[PDB]
């Protein structure tokens, strides 16, 4: 029947990390993760009036 | 079924992004996405906030 | 059966585009698409837009 | 059981075209297609003008 | 049992080590293993000031 | 996958032709086909002449 | 079907040896095998070698 | 039946010939085939007719 | 154990020979085969020439 295997994602993800490396992926993720920081903050101010 | 797998597109798309890179693909998409901006605008003129 | 796959064309087409690139393929297609312009015109002398 | 697949020719033909390219294959085919032009011409008897 | 193979990780891990090498991976691991040293120490110091 | 397949020769032959090319293979074959010309001639005396 | 294949290790080991070579692997092994020499000696104090 | 893989040798042999080429392999074989010439001669010294 | 997939060794061995070549492997083997010469000589007691 249909394959649809999660293991396929692990091998693919590994290749992506190796080609982009892990150190570089850190700056890219954190750089693009700036928007996430805002969502988290809005859904949890805890500080302002 | 196995005949039609969406996963095949994920792996192919990944290769395309790696070969064309992500930064370069940004300028290419935005450059070619100029026409889209017009469609969005036109379908938004006849509808104010 | 399990030998005729439409997906086979997608992967092959992708390779062709990458090897020939997309920008270069533009000039080649438009250059060779000159004959098509004539067919369209002949099958349509007038045009509302 | 499998054995003779027409699709096998499509993939092989694609490789041949890519390795030899399409522009180069044009001159080679037309250059070697000179003999064909003669056959067509000679058999022009059974073809009203 | 068919899919889901632990062995898949061994082959993948080997590739990662070869591409990143073993000597280089040493400095990277030890460099990033600095945080681990703190966890081990805290869970061993058991003596606040 | 597969066994005792004639198709294996087609793919291999294609590779040989591409690596050696077709134009070069022409001179090599004709150059080495000189002995064949003699066999054909001898088996075609038709008369003492 | 059997993922657990001993033969997989032979092919992988061969690649490692070729990439690292055999002469270089000699110095690396002997250099890192210094600790082993001590284990052997300690477990054989009552037996000079 | 089976249990053997002769075709495997044909593909491997082809690769060897392509990597070493055919012209170069000629000099190498003839150069190393000098010993064979002696065996043939000795096993023909007794009497060629 | 053994007597299976033996063909896997032939293909692997071929790759090793090609990567290390045959001429180079000669000096390496003979150089490392010096110890063997001694074993053969010592066991000359129970083996006449």
- Are the C-beta atoms of B10 and A12 separated by less than 8 Å? yes
- For chain A, the structural domain boundaries read 2-49
The crossing angle, in degrees rounded to 10, of helices G34-42 and G23-32 is 50
Q: How close does chain D come to F15, measured CA to CA in Å?
A: 9
- Asked whether H20 and I14 are in contact (CB, 8 A), the reply is no
| C-interface mutation test, from B1, B7, B15, most C Cβ less than 10 A away | B15
Cβ distance G11 to I16 less than 8 Å, yes or no, reads no
Please judge whether D12 and F7 are an interchain contact, meaning their C-beta atoms are less than 8 angstroms apart: no
The C-alpha atoms of residue C8 and residue D8 are separated, in whole angstroms, by: 11
Contacts of C7 in chain B (CB under 8 A): 4-5, 8
Instruction: Count the neighbouring beta carbons within 10 Å of the beta carbon of residue G37.
Output: 11
| CA atoms of B2 and A2, how far apart (whole Å) | 4
Q: How far apart are CA H47 and CA E41, in angstroms?
A: 92
What dihedral do alpha carbons G19, I15, H5, H14 form, nearest 10°? 140
Provide the token pair at D37.
């032009």
Closest listed residue to residue B18, CA positions, set I36, D12, A15, H41: A15
CB burial class (10 A; 0-12, 13-18, 19+) of residue H14? middle
Rounded-to-integer distance, Cα E29 and Cα E20, Å: 11
CATH annotation of I2-49: 1.20.5.3310
Q: Is the dihedral of CA G30, G34, G40, G44 positive or negative?
A: positive
User: What does the alpha-carbon distance between residue F30 and residue H30 come to, in Å, rounded to a whole number?
Assistant: 23
Given CB atoms, is E8 within the 8 Å cutoff of chain G? yes
| Whole-number CA gyration radius for chain G | 17
- d(Cα G42, Cα B14) in Å, to the nearest integer? 55
* Chains F and G: 3 or more CB pairs within 8 Å of each other: no
| Sequence-ordered list of residues with C-beta below 8 angstroms from that of D7, at least 6 positions apart, any chain | C3, C4, C5, C8
């Amino acid at each position: 029947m249909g394959g649809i295997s999660i293991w396929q994602l692990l091998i693919i993800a590994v290749i992506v990390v190796l080609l982009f490396g892990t150190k570089k992926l850190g700056s890219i993720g954190s750089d693009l993760g700036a928007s996430i920081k805002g969502f988290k903050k809005a859904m949890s101010d805890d500080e302002p009036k």
